[PDB]
Design an enzyme around this catalytic site. Structure first.
Site, short mmCIF file in Angstrom:
data_model
loop_
_atom_site.label_atom_id
_atom_site.label_comp_id
_atom_site.label_asym_id
_atom_site.label_seq_id
_atom_site.Cartn_x
_atom_site.Cartn_y
_atom_site.Cartn_z
N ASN B 10 71.13 -0.74 -20.25
CA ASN B 10 71.76 -0.70 -21.57
C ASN B 10 70.70 -0.67 -22.67
O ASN B 10 70.04 -1.68 -22.95
CB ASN B 10 72.68 -1.93 -21.72
CG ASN B 10 73.32 -2.04 -23.11
OD1 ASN B 10 73.26 -1.12 -23.91
ND2 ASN B 10 73.94 -3.18 -23.39
N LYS B 12 71.07 -0.51 -25.78
CA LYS B 12 71.50 -1.23 -26.98
C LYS B 12 71.24 -0.39 -28.25
O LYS B 12 71.26 0.83 -28.17
CB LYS B 12 70.89 -2.64 -27.05
CG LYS B 12 71.28 -3.50 -25.83
CD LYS B 12 70.96 -4.99 -26.01
CE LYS B 12 71.29 -5.78 -24.72
NZ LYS B 12 70.92 -7.22 -24.83
N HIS B 95 80.94 -6.23 -23.59
CA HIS B 95 79.61 -6.82 -23.70
C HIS B 95 79.66 -8.02 -24.65
O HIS B 95 80.35 -7.98 -25.67
CB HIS B 95 78.57 -5.79 -24.17
CG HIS B 95 77.15 -6.26 -24.03
ND1 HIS B 95 76.52 -7.04 -24.98
CD2 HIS B 95 76.24 -6.05 -23.05
CE1 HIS B 95 75.29 -7.30 -24.58
NE2 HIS B 95 75.09 -6.72 -23.41
N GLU B 97 77.68 -9.22 -26.83
CA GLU B 97 77.30 -8.97 -28.21
C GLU B 97 78.52 -8.53 -29.04
O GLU B 97 78.59 -8.80 -30.23
CB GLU B 97 76.13 -7.98 -28.29
CG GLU B 97 74.78 -8.64 -27.99
CD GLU B 97 73.69 -7.65 -27.58
OE1 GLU B 97 73.92 -6.42 -27.63
OE2 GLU B 97 72.59 -8.11 -27.20
N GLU B 169 76.95 -11.93 -17.35
CA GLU B 169 75.76 -12.16 -18.18
C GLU B 169 75.91 -13.46 -18.97
O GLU B 169 76.58 -13.49 -20.01
CB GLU B 169 75.51 -11.00 -19.16
CG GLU B 169 75.13 -9.65 -18.52
CD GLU B 169 74.49 -8.66 -19.51
OE1 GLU B 169 73.53 -7.95 -19.13
OE2 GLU B 169 74.93 -8.59 -20.68
N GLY B 175 68.77 -11.60 -23.97
CA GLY B 175 67.71 -11.28 -24.92
C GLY B 175 66.75 -12.43 -25.21
O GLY B 175 65.94 -12.35 -26.13
N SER B 215 68.14 -11.06 -19.28
CA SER B 215 66.72 -11.25 -19.00
C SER B 215 66.31 -10.85 -17.58
O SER B 215 65.27 -11.30 -17.08
CB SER B 215 66.30 -12.70 -19.31
OG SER B 215 66.73 -13.06 -20.62
CA CA Z 1 72.74 -5.91 -21.12
#
Ligand code: CA
Ligand code: CA
Lengths: 256, 256
Positions: B10, B12, B95, B97, B169, B175, B215
């Site tokens: 990904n 991003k 996701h 985020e 995740e 991140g 990560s």
């Molecule tokens: Ca990801």
């Protein structure tokens, strides 16, 4: 107090690869005078394709939205930096479909615009009131709050206003075929001029473009364009059709 | 109970036109066996460019997000129909985020996934808990609620599950450079297998892929990949770097 006319076409969430190639080519083939600004805004996955098909020296391409951070961990978003790397200089901010359907707040709209403007972009900044708000007699209060937020973020740096185009789109007019009357739209535009004169600058108010959107098309646009405070149009559904080109022609004849 | 390994990258909100051409070419030049699925997800304005640069018969391209309506008046959004017209068959949904920063709700994530799946797409469906939720001992409850919503939308049509890849995740791992231990990740994956067996099907649970993200990189991925319930990886920052290719190599050796 002489203003350059502006017309934008927002494709929204419509189009295939073939339709984009075909329709961009058709607009690009039309005569576009250097005395009017003409911008189209394809969906994000189509921007590259539209740029490649755009053979016109006058036609500009805009994005429909942008995020309010720079490059980083923001899955699904698009940055100002990405757009400029593609050679784009225009972006729509604060469209009502995003304010009212997807929860984008006044301040978030203002922060998106500020960042784009600081980087040197032109922003088509959208404001507008719902049917309920108009019924409760809050039309001008809503529209001015949305703009005030931008004024707040911008600051005493009024020079960034130079690259703002304000678009008024009453929410009840968006996609409904219920266009505002010249009287309704001109009233709101006059309201916004006066706010701009009071809160920003009298000379600025004479130069900033304020365009009308919401069911604008080739049949109803000429009368609207004769209102003194309506500097052009932000066109939705009709921008996908052959009459977008006719709107360009009429705008040129009316206001240049 | 033999599962095909899966690795996704990904990008991003990162990349320029030149970086996309260059990095896609570098991945596409690597040997990618037919026994592992490899997918990359560029930002939306870069999808066309990535497709043109992708000279590999194995490498697939995914979108990072999609909206939950078809083509229409949805300024700034992207439809399932648009992606398929571009020849894409993969999309990331839910996701963190977007769940935690941009207010995307459980049900909205579930509805996006359902629509993509009904059209024939493969969905990488993301679940995960925050540090606070883990501290309040709610890890499994959070993760299962997010999945349950999808089960709700899907219905007694369990056949649509066949094209789901679940990505776990932990939010505190995204991140931050704080990767989960094999013990922490395997525990959660085991939890999810059991839910799937109970609520969907025992045979299905043996075949659905569940990947780990947060990560993950070339240094820490091998140990993780030896956990029996971790079928591969969803890779963020590292997918932008040369070590993505090394991760592909190790995944192949570990799980095929
Ligand atoms: Ca990801
Ligand atoms: Ca519009």
């Amino acid at each position: 107090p002489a203003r350059r006319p502006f017309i934008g076409g927002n494709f929204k969430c419509n189009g295939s690869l073939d339709f984009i190639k075909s329709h961009v080519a058709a607009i690009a083939a039309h005569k576009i005078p250097d005395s009017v600004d003409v911008v189209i805004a394809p969906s994000a996955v189509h921007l590259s394709t539209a740029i490649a098909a755009n053979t016109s020296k006058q036609l500009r391409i805009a994005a429909q939205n942008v995020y309010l951070e720079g490059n980083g961990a923001w899955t699904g978003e698009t940055s100002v930096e990405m757009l400029q790397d593609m050679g784009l200089k225009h972006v729509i901010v604060g469209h009502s479909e995003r304010r009212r359907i997807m929860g984008e707040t006044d301040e978030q709209s203002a922060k998106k615009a500020k960042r784009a403007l600081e980087k040197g972009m032109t922003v088509i900044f959208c404001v507008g009131e719902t049917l309920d708000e108009r019924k409760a007699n809050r039309t001008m209060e809503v529209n001015i709050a949305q703009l005030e937020a931008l004024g707040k973020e911008l600051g005493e740096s009024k020079m960034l206003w130079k690259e703002v185009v304000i678009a008024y789109e009453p929410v009840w007019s968006i996609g409904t075929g219920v266009v505002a009357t010249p009287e309704q739209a001109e009233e709101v535009h006059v309201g916004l001029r006066k706010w701009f004169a009071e809160k920003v600058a009298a000379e600025g108010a004479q130069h900033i473009r304020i365009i009308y959107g919401g069911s604008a098309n080739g049949s109803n646009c000429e009368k609207l364009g004769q209102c003194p405070n309506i500097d052009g149009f932000l066109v939705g559904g009709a921008s996908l059709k052959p009459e977008f080109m006719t709107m360009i022609d009429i705008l040129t004849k009316t206001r240049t």
